Each structure stands twice: as C-alpha cells, then as structure tokens.
Amino acid sequence: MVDAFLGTWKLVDSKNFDDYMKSLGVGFATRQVASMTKPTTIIEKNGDILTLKTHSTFKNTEISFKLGVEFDETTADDRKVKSIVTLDGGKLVHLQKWDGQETTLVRELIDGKLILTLTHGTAVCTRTYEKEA
Numbered sequence: 001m002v003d004a005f006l007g008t009w010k011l012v013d014s015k016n017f018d019d020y021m022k023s024l025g026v027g028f029a030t031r032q033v034a035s036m037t038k039p040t041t042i043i044e045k046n047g048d049i050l051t052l053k054t055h056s057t058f059k060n061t062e063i064s065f066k067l068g069v070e071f072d073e074t075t076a077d078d079r080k081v082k083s084i085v086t087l088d089g090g091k092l093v094h095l096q097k098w099d100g101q102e103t104t105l106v107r108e109l110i111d112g113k114l115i116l117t118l119t120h121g122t123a124v125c126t127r128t129y130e131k132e133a
C-alpha cells in the first residue's frame with residue numbers, strides 16, 4: 001500500500017546532505033544553494049502510476065513510474081540513471097543505477113513524518129518532511 005505516502009510534504013530537517021551531494025560529485029556552488037533550500041515533495045497516484053514532484057526555488061524535478069518497473073530518470077544533478085521504485089517493509093525504496101554506481105532514496109513514515117534516507121558511497125543523509133494539509 002503506497003497510500004500513506006501520498007500528499008504534499010515540506011522539508012523540516014536535514015542531516016548530511018552536503019556529504020551526500022559531494023559523494024555524487026555536485027559542485028560547491030550547487031551544494032551551497034541546496035543546503036539552504038527547503039523543497040516541497042508532492043506524491044500522487046493515478047491507478048498504478050505514481051508521480052513524484054520536487055519543487056524548490058533552485059531545482060524542480062518530476063518523475064512518473066509504476067512500482068517495480070524500471071524507468072529512465074535524469075536527476076536534479078543531471079545524472080542519467082536507470083531507476084526502480086518498490087515497497088519494501090512498508091518503505092518506498094527508489095534505487096538509481098548509472099556507470100556501475102548506485103544510490104538509494106528510501107522513504108519511511110515515522111510518527112506521521114516522512115523520513116528520506118539518501119545513501120551513496122559511505123554518505124548517509126537523513127531528511128525529514130512534514131505533511132502539508
């Protein structure tokens with residue numbers, strides 16, 4: 001069931017995002033702006049198709065996908081990756097693969113907040129999102 005993830009979510013806490021971005025090769029000026037933005041994430045479904053928007057004053061993205069079906073994605077930092085999103089232990093797990101590299105974007109609901117854990121290399125970033133009414 002993906003339904004408790006659906007809605008509009010606002011960033012309210014971030015840990016180690018600079019380490020994560022630097023692990024991906026994001027340049028210092030982009031990391032600087034991204035360390036101060038607070039994106040809004042919108043997760044919607046229509047039948048079997050999920051759409052995940054990320055909006056901010058700096059970068060915007062949007063992806064649509066079916067759980068368990070690979071899709072091409074061009075990330076906010078301009079990586080061209082092979083992606084798949086699935087539910088695993090009630091967590092929404094997004095795996096990106098490119099050039100033999102991987103990164104995971106794992107979303108979990110804890111006490112009504114959405115916790116996004118971003119892992120690449122040894123870098124582990126935890127970002128916390130609050131639901132907007």
Ligand SMILES: CCCCCCCCCCCCCCCCCCCCCCCC(=O)O
Pocket residue numbers: 011021024026030034037039041054055056058059060061075076077116127
């Ligand atoms: C798809 C997310 C980016 C669009 C809004 C991003 C503002 C900064 C936060 C998100 C990505 C950062 C943009 C700068 C390049 C780093 C991007 C690394 C992959 C995107 C991570 C998204 C993290 C977030 O959804 O909280």
Ligand SMILES: N[C@@H]1[C@@H](O)[C@H](O)[C@@H](COP(=O)(O)O)O[C@@H]1O
Pocket residue numbers: 058059060061073074075076077078
């Ligand atoms: N098609 C691409 C996206 O795949 C890429 O992620 C994005 C970069 O982020 P932004 O749109 O904020 O420049 O540019 C375009 O929209």
